[PDB]
Amino acid sequence: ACLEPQITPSYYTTSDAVISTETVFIVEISLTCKNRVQNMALYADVGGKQFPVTRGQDVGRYQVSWSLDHKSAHAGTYEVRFFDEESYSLLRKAQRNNEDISIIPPLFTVSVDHRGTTEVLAAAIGLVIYYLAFSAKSHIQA
Amino acid sequence: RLLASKSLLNRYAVEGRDLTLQYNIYNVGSSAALDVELSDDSFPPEDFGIVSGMLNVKWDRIAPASNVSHTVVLRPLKAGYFNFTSATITYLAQEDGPVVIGSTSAPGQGGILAQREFDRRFSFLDWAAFGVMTLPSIGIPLLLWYSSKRKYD
């Protein structure tokens, strides 16, 4: 097992709902262990949904990503809980048993702060002001 | 038996902007695929900066009737036409079996728009700033005309 996990998290969240259909969350972590155990499999849980965690090309780099509808990707902090194989197996057992999933400690957690996701008007304003100017001209000449 | 798809999630590829590639691998076989490796050498680092994700990824096991999704965020450094070729996937169909080599779907040739051309086609706040800039042209006569009218009407 990884003893004393030291993590450096880096995360990205889609900010713009005009060019994307769904809000994508990307969390990269570098993991270093005191016992220098490498190439462990990690599993992520976000709000009780489990997502596969990939291993980076570099040793100890891991990435998890999930997407949410812009309506459901509310602004706020999303806690990503990472589990090892053993704790992940326990989590899957508790979930199958409808046991309290909170009893099972994650290996570490990462807080992802999500902030959330003219020419017609210019013509209209110029048109209205010009039209009233035309009315003014009529009254002036009337 | 693994089925894999490569998709480009961006509606527009733009020079200097993030380009998101998603790889979805589906095990449709009756057994688990072992030592599943995905490699996509199609993106030379001289033309694409890796912002997030990996072109090379390995999974120890994919359970039967299960799937894995991998996402890579690249940044194209040059505008032009680029061919999003298929990535290569290798896996073992059985323990001590032969390595099976598969390929993902190929999205095909996509155009990377130059940043200037993207802005020309899709560039908001410009009008917000521009609106005020037009006012000064008529400041003097606009006030004077009514002031004189009021002094005589």
Q: ∠ CA(B130), CA(B135), CA(B136), 5° rounding?
A: 115
The whole-angstrom distance between B70's CA and the closest CA on chain A is 7
A40, with CB counted inside 10 A (0-12, 13-18, 19+), is: middle
Annotate A57-100 with DSSP letters as a single string: SSTTEEEEEEEEETTTS-SEEEEEEEE-HHHHHHHHHHHHHT--
What are B117's two structure tokens? 């051309």
Please judge whether A54 and B57 are an interchain contact, meaning their C-beta atoms are less than 8 angstroms apart: yes
Select the residue from B35, B40, B57 to test the A interface by mutation, using most A Cβ atoms within 10 A.
B57
A41, A12, A52: which is closest to B20 by C-alpha? A12
How many beta-carbon contacts under 8 Å exist across A and B?
38
Please check whether residue A28 is in contact with residue A62, taking contact to mean a CB–CB distance below 8 angstroms.
yes
Which residues is chain A interrupted after (C–N above 2.5 Å)? 117
Phi and psi of B11, rounded to 5°?
Answer: -70, -35
Candidate from A19, A41, A54 with C-beta closest to B70 = A54
A82, with CB counted inside 10 A (0-12, 13-18, 19+), is: buried
How far apart (Å, rounded) are the C-alpha atoms in residues B18 and B77? 10
The whole-angstrom distance between B149's CA and the closest CA on chain A is 11
Report how far apart, in Å, the C-alpha atoms of A110 and of each of A14, A64, B35 are. Answer: 17, 11, 28
How far apart (Å, rounded) are the C-alpha atoms in residues B116 and B138? 34
Please check whether residue B113 is in contact with residue B15, taking contact to mean a CB–CB distance below 8 angstroms.
yes
What are A58's two structure tokens? 């570099």
Please judge whether A55 and B20 are an interchain contact, meaning their C-beta atoms are less than 8 angstroms apart: no
